[PDB]
């Protein structure tokens, strides 16, 4: 489970770096990994996950 | 008695003033080789900074060079001509009386070759072309890594 989490986080981050347009300021991307964790907890609790904006 | 010889190289055009009054056989050897085209597409196989640019070898190695009087001819050490400064044309030789086709040319005053090299001209135009040819990068055996060749040599009179 710890290894699956490491691999999953690396994959989501690589996708986000390659998705971001050139020239956007790109410090907060670990922010997106926090959104990923919260969405997973929302799925486990069957709570709809919808971040405004 | 001066004769122009134009060496169009890859770094500019050298105009050479040949001294027919002082070293006539060597000068007319240079004229005939340039006029036949023996120097066309021929590289400067040795460049040593603050010393020398040598060329004229058709094999590009430094052992070749075929003159017009057979293989070699004699040295003409006229005692009024010295290697007094940059841009002075002389004949490169293995030893005494072994002048062939390769031309030495001083980039700096080199007055230790008097008595063993035959001055037979100078540059009349193109001294900055010669300076930058001296500023090219080379290897351990002084051959230019960046390639310098006389594209075409001809005569003006």
């Amino acid at each position: 489970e710890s290894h699956f989490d490491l691999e999953l986080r690396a994959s989501v981050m690589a996708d986000l770096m390659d998705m971001m347009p050139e020239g956007i300021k790109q410090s907060k991307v670990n922010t997106v990994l926090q959104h990923l964790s919260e969405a997973w907890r929302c799925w486990k609790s069957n709570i709809p996950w919808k971040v405004p904006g | 008695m001066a004769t122009d010889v134009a060496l169009e190289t890859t770094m500019g055009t050298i105009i050479l003033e040949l001294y027919n009054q002082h070293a006539p056989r060597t000068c007319e050897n240079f004229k005939t080789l340039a006029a036949r085209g023996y120097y066309d597409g021929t590289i400067f196989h040795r460049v040593i900074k603050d010393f020398m640019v040598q060329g004229g070898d058709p094999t590009g190695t430094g052992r070749g060079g075929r003159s017009i009087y057979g293989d070699t001819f004699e040295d003409e050490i006229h005692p009024g001509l010295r290697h007094t400064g940059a841009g002075i044309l002389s004949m490169a030789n293995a030893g005494p009386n072994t002048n062939g086709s390769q031309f030495f040319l001083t980039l700096a005053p080199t007055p230790w070759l008097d008595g063993k090299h035959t001055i037979f001209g100078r540059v009349k135009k193109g001294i900055r072309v010669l300076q930058r040819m001296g500023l090219v990068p080379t290897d351990a055996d002084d051959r230019p890594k960046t390639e310098i060749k006389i594209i075409r040599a001809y005569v003006v009179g």
Binding site: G23 | R128, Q131, R132, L135
Partner: protein
């Protein structure tokens, strides 16, 4: 022209990319130096003219009108690109002080 310039600055306040920020910063820094000393520029130009004439890279010629025309034999009068001696312009102490005080002012702000 003034009011269109002011409106352009107002529209260009918000961040777009670092190329725009670099262009804005350079234009503001040029304005903050202000008008160049064309007298000092021309003194340096004439000193370079006589020095390059002595060094043989400038030909002083006279045409059919009898006027001083300088000819750069190379192209290295105006730019130190293609100049083999580009690495020996030791700048003036006043120039170094002015650049350092510029950077100190930026730090303070």
């Amino acid at each position: 022209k003034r009011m269109k310039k002011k409106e352009a600055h107002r529209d260009d306040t918000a961040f777009r990319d670092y190329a725009r920020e670099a262009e804005k910063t350079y234009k503001r820094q040029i304005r903050n130096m202000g008008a160049p000393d064309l007298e000092k520029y021309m003194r340096e130009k004439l000193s370079a003219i006589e020095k390059a004439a002595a060094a043989g890279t400038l030909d002083i010629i006279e045409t059919e009108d009898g006027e001083m025309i300088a000819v750069d034999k190379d192209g290295t009068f105006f730019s130190t690109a293609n100049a083999t001696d580009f690495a020996q312009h030791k700048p003036d102490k006043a120039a170094v002080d002015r650049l350092v005080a510029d950077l100190r002012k930026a730090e303070e702000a």
